Amino acid sequence: SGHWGAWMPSTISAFEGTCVSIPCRFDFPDELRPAVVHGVWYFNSNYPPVVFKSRTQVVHESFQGRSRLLGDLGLRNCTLLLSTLSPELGGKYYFRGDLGGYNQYTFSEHSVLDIVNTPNIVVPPEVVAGTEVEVSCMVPDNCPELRPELSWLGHEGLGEPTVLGRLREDEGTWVQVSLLHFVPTREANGHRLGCQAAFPNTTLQFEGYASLDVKYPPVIVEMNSSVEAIEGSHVSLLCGADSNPPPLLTWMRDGMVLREAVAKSLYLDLEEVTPGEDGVYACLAENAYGQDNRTVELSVMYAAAAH
Ligand SMILES: *[C@@H]1O[C@H](CO)[C@@H](O[C@@H]2O[C@H](CO)[C@@H](O[C@@H]3O[C@H](CO[C@H]4O[C@H](CO)[C@@H](O)[C@H](O)[C@@H]4O)[C@@H](O)[C@H](O)[C@@H]3O)[C@H](O)[C@H]2NC(C)=O)[C@H](O)[C@H]1NC(C)=O
Ligand SMILES: *[C@@H]1O[C@H](CO)[C@@H](O)[C@H](O)[C@H]1NC(C)=O
Ligand SMILES: *[C@@H]1O[C@H](CO)[C@@H](O)[C@H](O)[C@H]1NC(C)=O
Ligand SMILES: *[C@@H]1O[C@H](CO)[C@@H](O)[C@H](O)[C@H]1NC(C)=O
Ligand SMILES: *[C@H]1O[C@H](CO)[C@@H](O)[C@H](O)[C@@H]1O
């Protein structure tokens, strides 16, 4: 139609020290035919500073030499270019139309600018060993003058990355996405995943890091061999298990629980050990992703000396 209104991405992101182009289109009643279209861009911070003002060419000091209007206002194109970004410039940007006389219109729709300094690494909330896992590095690509070069850090045993390239997201903005597809093992637990966004012809370089929390079933690593004890002596049986999260350890005999605790290792203490304590003892390691069990035989085969 021919009505008052604007169109711009509600949210948009860009790296610190780079630039950002905020795509903008506005509309007005055709009946006016002003032949001269003026406009004003405001920043979020009762008395908002002026980013751009076509009539008086006035610019707030925080935007001087950093703000430039791309596209013709006469073509209903209010696209804004912001250069040499700094955290201070993070906030809401809204546009105001000026068609002379009483025809000034501050449009409702605005754009939130998020200035970042680290790439976005996306890891699924639950990484389990033995399952194919996708990990992505996302980076804003809304700067026409400076294109980010995406790269991974510390991804040796995770396979070679697959670059998706420039992808469109909602509200008509752009991102750079790189992928990692791999089946992690228990060894991949605690793996440092790093992503780097570098800009050629500049000294700008941004790095982000994340640690892989890889879940895996218990594997009993510490277990006593065949125990041959002296009569009346003290016997300590130790059972250690490696799992993520830490397992529930349980010492059992004759289908009866002797000791039980949520830990990496668990001791079973036997005092004044008699031949009646002979038999097979079992340690059970169990968590949310599996279980493991080991048995040990206890033999009181050494007679106690007189003392
Ligand atoms: C409102 O005004 C905006 C600004 O005036 C308009 O945005 C511009 O739209 C034009 C299309 O007419 C774009 O020009 C194109 O640019 C691409 C650049 O891609 C290549 O170049 C980069 C670096 O140079 C390179 O890294 C890439 O790999 C590509 O090879 C060219 O490929 C095209 O041939 C064409 O020249 C402007 O780039 C674009 N500017 C911005 C800031 O977005 C907008 O379209 C206007 N809106 C409407 C509705 O007309
Ligand atoms: C980046 O390249 C432009 C021209 O492509 C050049 O004018 C500018 O000096 C370069 N930046 C740096 C930091 O050298
Ligand atoms: C079982 O192994 C643990 C750790 O190696 C040790 O401390 C403990 O004494 C062993 N048990 C016996 C009965 O030797
Ligand atoms: C102990 O682990 C073995 C794996 O070989 C499994 O077959 C068995 O059912 C387990 N026993 C118990 C009581 O969970
Ligand atoms: C703009 O001005 C008002 C809206 O505030 C209406 O008369 C009409 O929508 C026009 O486009």
Side-chain angles (χ1 to χ4, degrees):
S1 303
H3 65 296
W4 290 108
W7 294 270
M8 68 183 70
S10 57
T11 62
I12 188 171
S13 61
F15 276 105
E16 174 184 354
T18 72
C19 76
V20 56
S21 171
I22 309 178
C24 181
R25 181 180 64 91
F26 66 98
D27 199 340
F28 55 87
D30 299 37
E31 305 293 293
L32 302 181
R33 304 180 188 92
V36 185
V37 175
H38 286 286
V40 183
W41 274 96
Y42 292 101
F43 190 46
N44 64 341
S45 61
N46 296 329
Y47 299 90
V50 174
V51 180
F52 174 86
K53 188 168 183 180
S54 53
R55 283 199 183 272
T56 57
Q57 295 178 337
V58 67
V59 179
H60 187 269
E61 285 73 10
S62 298
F63 294 96
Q64 290 187 6
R66 311 167 78 186
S67 59
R68 171 188 170 188
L69 183 71
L70 300 180
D72 200 328
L73 290 188
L75 300 175
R76 297 149 182 266
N77 190 338
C78 50
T79 299
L80 179 65
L81 177 63
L82 301 179
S83 302
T84 321
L85 296 178
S86 48
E88 43 158 353
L89 300 187
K92 175 202 298 181
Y93 291 81
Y94 59 93
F95 179 75
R96 173 178 175 89
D98 189 350
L99 300 189
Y102 294 94
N103 287 325
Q104 298 80 24
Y105 203 100
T106 299
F107 303 99
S108 303
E109 18 268 348
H110 54 81
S111 180
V112 174
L113 176 59
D114 183 29
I115 303 181
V116 303
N117 50 17
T118 53
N120 197 293
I121 297 179
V122 180
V123 178
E126 189 175 26
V127 178
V128 187
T131 72
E132 49 172 329
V133 177
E134 170 183 322
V135 176
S136 60
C137 179
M138 189 177 305
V139 151
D141 192 17
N142 304 316
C143 176
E145 296 175 319
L146 291 178
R147 292 307 205 95
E149 181 176 357
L150 210 50
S151 296
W152 287 97
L153 300 176
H155 64 289
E156 304 83 4
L158 298 182
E160 302 191 31
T162 61
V163 184
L164 299 186
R166 186 184 192 187
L167 304 184
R168 180 192 177 274
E169 51 187 9
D170 295 328
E171 297 282 2
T173 46
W174 303 89
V175 290
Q176 289 281 347
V177 180
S178 186
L179 283 182
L180 289 176
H181 272 70
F182 60 94
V183 179
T185 62
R186 54 187 53 237
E187 288 80 1
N189 188 36
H191 187 81
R192 213 210 342 273
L193 255 182
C195 183
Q196 175 181 109
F199 296 85
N201 182 68
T202 71
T203 57
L204 296 177
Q205 194 178 50
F206 307 95
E207 303 174 8
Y209 292 92
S211 63
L212 290 181
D213 195 331
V214 181
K215 303 293 185 298
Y216 53 90
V219 171
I220 298 181
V221 290
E222 184 74 51
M223 193 65 182
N224 294 111
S225 54
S226 297
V227 173
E228 302 159 354
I230 303 179
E231 171 187 12
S233 65
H234 172 71
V235 171
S236 291
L237 300 180
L238 182 58
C239 172
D242 180 34
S243 70
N244 182 24
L248 175 71
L249 298 178
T250 309
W251 276 110
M252 294 184 62
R253 182 173 81 113
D254 303 326
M256 190 65 179
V257 175
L258 306 183
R259 195 176 187 183
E260 188 181 37
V262 183
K264 300 180 63 63
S265 64
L266 183 59
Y267 270 107
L268 181 61
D269 289 318
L270 307 174
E271 296 149 349
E272 283 189 323
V273 189
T274 59
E277 312 294 326
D278 290 328
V280 181
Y281 290 77
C283 177
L284 313 188
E286 177 168 322
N287 70 347
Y289 304 96
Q291 59 193 50
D292 184 21
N293 59 79
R294 292 287 296 277
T295 55
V296 57
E297 181 183 2
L298 168 65
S299 297
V300 190
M301 70 182 206
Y302 293 110
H307 189 69

